[PDB]
Structure formats: structure tokens, C-alpha cells
Amino acid sequence: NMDVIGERIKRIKEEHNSTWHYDDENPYKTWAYHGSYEVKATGSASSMINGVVKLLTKPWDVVPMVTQMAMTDTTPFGQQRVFKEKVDTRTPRPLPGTRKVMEITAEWLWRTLGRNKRPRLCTREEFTKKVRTNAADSAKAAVEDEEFWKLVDRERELHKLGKCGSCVYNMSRAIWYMWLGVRYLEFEALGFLNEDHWFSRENSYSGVEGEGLHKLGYILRDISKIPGGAMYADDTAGWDTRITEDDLHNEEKIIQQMDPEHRQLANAIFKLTYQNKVVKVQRPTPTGTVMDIISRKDQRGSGQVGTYGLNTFTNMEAQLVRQMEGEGVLTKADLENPHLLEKKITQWLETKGVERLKRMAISGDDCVVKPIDDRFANALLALNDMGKVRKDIPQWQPSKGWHDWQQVPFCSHHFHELIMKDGRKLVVPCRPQDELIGRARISQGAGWSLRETACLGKAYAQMWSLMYFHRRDLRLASNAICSAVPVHWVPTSRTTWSIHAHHQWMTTEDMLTVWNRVWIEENPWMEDKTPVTTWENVPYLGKREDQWCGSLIGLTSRATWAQNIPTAIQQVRSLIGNEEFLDYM
Ligand SMILES: COc1ccc(CC(=O)O)cc1-c1ccsc1
Ligand SMILES: [Zn+2]
Ligand SMILES: [Zn+2]
């Protein structure tokens, strides 16, 4: 395997020849270990607390989930722990018949996805514009430097020769240039999947790319109208670690639809950075901290450009295979059979495939499936055999589905149908409230001024106004944060990296105006475009639902907090200084 990965290791070895060594106490069992070199410790044992959000959410100072989120270890100790538990495993190879069905389904799926769109290369200017409209950091400085682009051209020339020299995945200025350059090249060859929305619902049927969190609930409610069995939402245990060599070969089939110049570069990403990979991971030792150089031929690199799209692809494929087994199209004998008859698989795909894709909502490893009946609950032979073993359940125990789309978990949320005072219905996203408060209380990094902290707090408050306004405690805390932070201060940083986040809260525009735009004007499931003129007409969950989902409403500590909130707002204001503030209470 050194013929593909050798050059990359050689450059790492030569760059760190001062401290390069083969550690014999290295813990890698399924990854090939190449060597180590000394580094300085990266990450922290805990996370920095947002004092603005914390001062305005006092009742949650005594909440266990809120305290757990304040932790999260990112040190070389924390890295090694998660690695041992998840990453250092081997997925048994699927059976010959399973491999055949997967190949037939992948070919059909790629042709269906490419029926209107044609693959294309992504550019230097697209990558630049994206980096620009994100930070405005060191990534924007590299994009601005012509010497970074000349390193890109040189690595590209190697890729055209079927070689790689610096595309290394990470679990001072030269190494940063090689990392960003590796990501640019991946984006150039596979970025079209994201940039041209191959996984939009109109293009993929099952996909939800570009839809946004506030649209996911409406999609689940539309799926519920399709005749069939229950709605299933099974969680795979560590999806990225279950991506097999057979999955990678099926994913690669997209190169068949590419122009010759694009195919060569995409083939280079697939063969050299997906099907072979060189990975850097930190590790503590009695001597200090080391960086290990490891490699393998399968699994998915979590941080890559193609990750979301290719996980969505393989999960759509895997769920269609499970649907076929549920329908009796695929038997136990079929999966073991190398000479499995292609005809009934092709017939099912050509006659039912698209209708079956419409019964699903698939976002990377997250899936919701409404099969034609409940035989799907016990259709586990292919799912387990493909390596997509469900999390925290015996392997052969039937899946439990839901007969109400409002109970279905999808993308860390569930969704409620609300009735507004004017009789119109809204479908809103929701999750346990402690997870929302616990996240907002976290500031990312260190050395942040009260202004930056207050502005991130404002971002969280405004996200709650737009997505979670239906939670009494979050509307109150949101109003308190926005009252404590100067009106003209622009929310900074980000509340989430989710593909489902459109960041409509990253503004100084009136939140009720933005609310109306999102939930009324631009909402395709809102036939009546009558604007809501007051927050008084913006609904809450029913009190019992709010409580079932974590509200502290009805508690004394909460009644005391609500009563005394103008005092805490005033305290934050007095520390921020002589700025313009608006009272939202
Ligand atoms: C499906 O949308 C999500 C999924 C998870 C998360 C949590 C996180 O990324 O910290 C946030 C969102 C989200 C998206 C728009 S507002 C909040
Ligand atoms: Zn490379
Ligand atoms: Zn809820």
C-alpha cells in the first residue's frame, strides 16, 4: 500500500526528522501505524462559559445536562479515548449477494441523481467567495496569497499523474497551506455535490439539502400522508466507521458522468484520499505529546467536503436495499448468492425505486423511512450485512417505528404541529430544552472580549426567536439577552455548523420581521400570507408539551427568575457600559 501513501509519509518524516521515531507503545490495531513526532498539546479539558447567557439563565445553573456540555475534552487524552472506542475497528465484509444488490442500486441511484444535473469542477473563485462570506481568519489570508494557489497547482499536477504528496487528514504556515490546499482540491473535484444541490429534495427525492431546519418538520408531515407502515428512524452506531471498501467503490461510480478533465481529478480524490488515507492524530506519552501518522483503506473522514453528500448517497442506497428485503424482493439466500439474479432488483428499481425514495428523508447518516408495510421492522439481514448496524439494540431485535410523525427523531430534533390564535398551523422544530440552554452557555475558544461574548449570546437568543420561539423559557431568555446586549451590535461567530442552519438570526433586523419572512412569506406550507404583527400572536407549545420537552414553567425557581430578570439584564448592561439598549420585556 506504500505506492499510494508513501510520498505523503516521506514528506512528514523529512519535515520532522529532528524528532521522528517508531513508538512501540502505539495503540493502533486496525489502522497501519507509520511513526510519530513531538508536538505541543492542542485542545482543552473543559469549554469556556458564555457569562452573558449564564447570568441570564440562573435556574439552569442547577441542571445536570447543562453542566455536562460545559465539559467535552479536546486534549490528546480526549482524542485517544474516542479513537479507541469508535475509530479503531474493522467492519466485516458484506456477503457476495449483498455486494451485488448494493452495486445494482448504486448504479441506478447515480443515474437517477444525474438525470438533470451534470457533474462539473468547482473553482478557486467559488472557494474564495465561500471562505470570504464565512469569516468576513488564517483561511482568508491563505486564499489572498498567490503562493497558496501555486502549491495547489503543484499538488494538482501530482494528482493528474496519479500521485499525492500533501493531502493529509487531521483528527505552522506551510502545514496550514497543505491542509487548506487538500480541502480545495477535494472541493474542486467533489464540491459540485454540495454547490449544485445534488441532494436537494427535488433532485434526490429522499434528500433534504438546502431545505433548512424549519422545513424538516413539514417534510416529515408530508411523508406521513403516504400510505404504508410506521415511520422508522434507526440510528447507525458510528456511521463513518462503517463505510466499507465496497461502499467507496459504489460511491466512485459518479466519475462515469464526468467530463474527462473532471474525471481524472475526481478519480485522484477517490483513489488517493478516500480509498487510501494518511491521517494525523495527537497522543499523550510520559515524555509529552506526539503526533501519530496512521493509514487505512476504508471508513469516512468526518471533516471532508464530500462526506455529507456521499453519506447521504450510501444511506439512500442502504435504505432502498432494506425496503427491498422488507418487500420480499431480497431473501437470505439472495444475499449469500454470488450469482444472484439482477432482473428482479432492476425491475423493482425501475418500477418502484423513485416512489420508494419519496417515502424517505435522508440527511447523511440520519434517516426516516415510511415503508409500504411493517415487514421492514424485521428486515435486518441486508442492513446488518452492509455494516450499518443499529446503535444500542441487539442485532436481530425488530426496529420500533412511530405511528405519529411528531414523535419521529430526525437531525437531533422532533417536530410539533402548532395552531396559531388565527387558526393557521405551523410545524416547528424542537429538542430537550437543556440541550438548547447548555449549548448557548458555551463560548468557543478563549481570549474573547465581553463584546464578542455578548454578540454570540445575541446570536443564540435570535436563533431561539426564529426556531424555538414556541418554548416559553427560551422566548423569555431570548428577550432578556436581546435587552442586555446593545441593539446595534451585530451577532458574531456561529451558533451551529449544521448544514440545516441558514443563519437568518445573524442580523440586527427586527426578529419579528425575520420571523414573518421565514414562517409566513417564504414558507411554502403557509397558504395564507397574512403577516403576524405582534409576538403575542406567535404561538407557544401547549404548556404540557413545553414541560414534556424540558420547560421549567410551573416551578418556583423559574417564577423567581422571570420576576427578577430586569435586575440581571441591568447588571449585564452596567458591565457592558453606556450603549443603546432596547427593553424587550
Ligand atoms: C437540523 O438542525 C440542527 C441540528 C443540530 C444542531 C446542534 C448543533 O449543531 O450544535 C443545530 C441545528 C440547527 C439548525 C438550524 S438552527 C439549529
Ligand atoms: Zn494530494
Ligand atoms: Zn418538543
3-class state of residue 318 by DSSP: helix
Instruction: Tell me, in angstroms, the distance from the centre of ligand 2 to residue 304's CA.
Output: 13
Tell whether 94 and 229 lie within a shared domain.
yes
- C-alpha distances (whole Å) from 527 to each of 382, 424, 532, 572 are 42, 9, 14, 42
Contact predicate 331/377, CB 8 Å: no
- Resolution to one decimal, Å: 2.0
Residues 256 and 397 in one domain: yes
433: nearest Cα among 45, 69, 52, 55: 69
Query: CB within 8 A of 294, min separation 6: which ones?
Result: 28, 31, 32, 33, 34, 278, 279, 281
My answer on whether 355 and 227 are in the same domain is: yes
First to last CA, the chain: 65
Closest CA to 540 of 462, 457, 474, 463: 474
Given 297, 328, 351, the domain boundary residue is 297
Specify whether 106 is located in the same domain as 48. no
CA of 166 to the centre of ligand 2 (A): 5
Q: What is the residue with the minimal CA distance to atom 7 of ligand 1?
A: 496
Kindly state whether residues 557 and 417 are assigned to the same domain: yes
Whether residues 221 and 110 share a domain: the answer is: yes
- Experimental approach: X-ray
Query: Which three cell numbers mark 398?
Result: 425488530
* Region class of 222: left (phi > 0), else alpha (psi between -120 and 50), else beta: alpha
Verify that 340 and 386 share a domain, yes or no: yes
Same domain, 208 and 315: yes
Residues 6+ apart with CB under 8 A from 267: 252, 255
- Nearest Cα neighbor of 450 from 1, 40, 49, 118 is 49
Residue 279 CA from chain centroid, whole number:
21
Please enumerate, by residue number, every residue annotated as part of a binding site for Zn(2+): 155, 159, 164, 167, 414, 430, 549
Q: Which-ligand-closest: CA of 406?
A: 3
Q: What are phi and psi of 552, to 5 degrees?
A: -95, 10
Same domain, 99 and 212: yes
d(CA 213, CA 201): 14
Place of cell 483503506: 297
Residue where one domain finishes, among candidates 348, 382, 411: 411
Measured in Å, residue 438 CA sits from the centre of ligand 1 at 13
Ligand at minimal distance from the CA of 408 is 3
Same-domain check for residues 244 and 317: yes
Select from 500, 504, 515, 519 the residue to mutate for testing ligand 1; criterion: most ligand atoms less than 8 Å from CB: 500
Give the domain range for residue 97: 90-121+191-274+298-411
Nearest CA to ligand 1 atom 10: 496
Q: Which atom of ligand 1 is nearest to the CA of 495?
A: 10
Say yes or no: 455 and 575 in one domain.
yes
Looking at 393, 411, 429, which one is the last position of a domain? 411
Q: In this structure, are residues 428 and 545 in contact, taking their beta carbons and an 8 Å threshold?
A: no
Q: Which atom of ligand 1 is nearest to the CA of 502?
A: 15
* Judgement on whether residues 268 and 378 belong to the same structural domain of the protein: yes
How remote is the CA of residue 145 from the centroid of ligand 1, in Å? 33
Total domain count for the chain? 4
Whole-number Å distance, alpha carbon 460 to ligand 1 midpoint, is 11
The domain that contains 282 carries what CATH number?
Answer: 3.30.70.2840
- Ligand 1 lining (C-beta closer than 6 Å): 213, 411-413, 439, 463, 467, 496-498, 500-501
Conformational region of residue 164, where left means phi above 0, alpha means psi within -120 to 50, and beta covers everything else:
beta
Closest ligand to Cα 269:
2
169-170 and 366-369 strand pairing: unpaired
Task: Give the span between the Cα atoms of 174 and 356, in whole angstroms.
Answer: 49
Three-class secondary structure of residue 352 per DSSP:
helix
